[PDB]
Structures are given as structure tokens and as C-alpha cells.
């Protein structure tokens, strides 16, 4: 009677599971894409350094 | 005279021996009420289990 009632929550466990990998998914791929932001900064910034007045 | 002594001698042992018989059977057919118990619940169980699982 006590199994026959927690039914509900026994999958309602998998459900949150299930939705907080999916957004570690989801945060793994927003830290690439602010890391390739930095990326672009970090070449653009070495063509200040070549533009020779620019960098004085 | 002493012979009919003898046969209550003789009648003492087949009370004992009555008496022994009677309780030997008690003593196993008390045992048979765990055994035939143990199996009733298992058979409970299992309706349960299947009741549950279908449930679920």
C-alpha cells in the first residue's frame, strides 16, 4: 500500500534527473561559446598590437 | 496370580506408547501450521508484487 502509493514520485525523480543533465548539457555548451568569445578577443587584440601607431 | 500384573505392566506400556503417538502427531502437526502458513503468504505476496507491478 505504501509502494502501490509512492508511484508518483518514484518517476517524478527520473523527470528531474533527466531535465538537470540536459541543462548541464546546455551550461557546458554556453562556457564554449563565452570561451570562443574570449578566443575572438584575444586575436583581434593581437592586430592592435601589429597596427604599429595604434600600439604606440 | 502374578501374570495379570504382568498384562498391567504391559497395558502401562501401550498407554505410554498411545500417549507418545498422540504426542508425536501433535508435535508435527503443529509443525505442518508453519509450513502450510509460509505458504499462504508467499502466495499472497506474489499477488501482490503482480498487482503492483501491474500498477506501475
Avoid: C, H
Avoid at chain 2, 16 to 21: G, L, R
Amino acid at each position: 500500500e505504501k509502494k502501490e502509493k509512492q508511484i508518483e514520485q518514484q518517476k517524478k525523480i527520473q523527470m528531474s534527473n533527466l531535465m538537470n543533465q540536459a541543462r548541464l548539457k546546455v551550461l557546458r555548451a554556453r562556457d564554449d561559446l563565452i570561451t570562443d568569445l574570449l578566443n575572438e578577443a584575444k586575436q583581434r587584440l593581437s592586430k592592435v598590437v601589429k597596427d604599429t601607431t595604434r600600439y604606440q | 496370580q502374578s501374570q495379570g500384573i504382568q498384562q498391567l505392566l504391559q497395558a502401562e506400556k501401550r498407554a505410554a506408547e498411545k500417549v507418545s503417538e498422540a504426542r508425536k502427531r501433535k508435535n508435527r502437526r503443529l509443525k505442518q501450521a508453519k509450513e502450510e502458513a509460509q505458504a499462504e503468504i508467499e502466495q499472497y505476496r506474489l499477488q501482490r508484487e503482480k498487482e503492483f507491478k501491474a500498477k506501475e
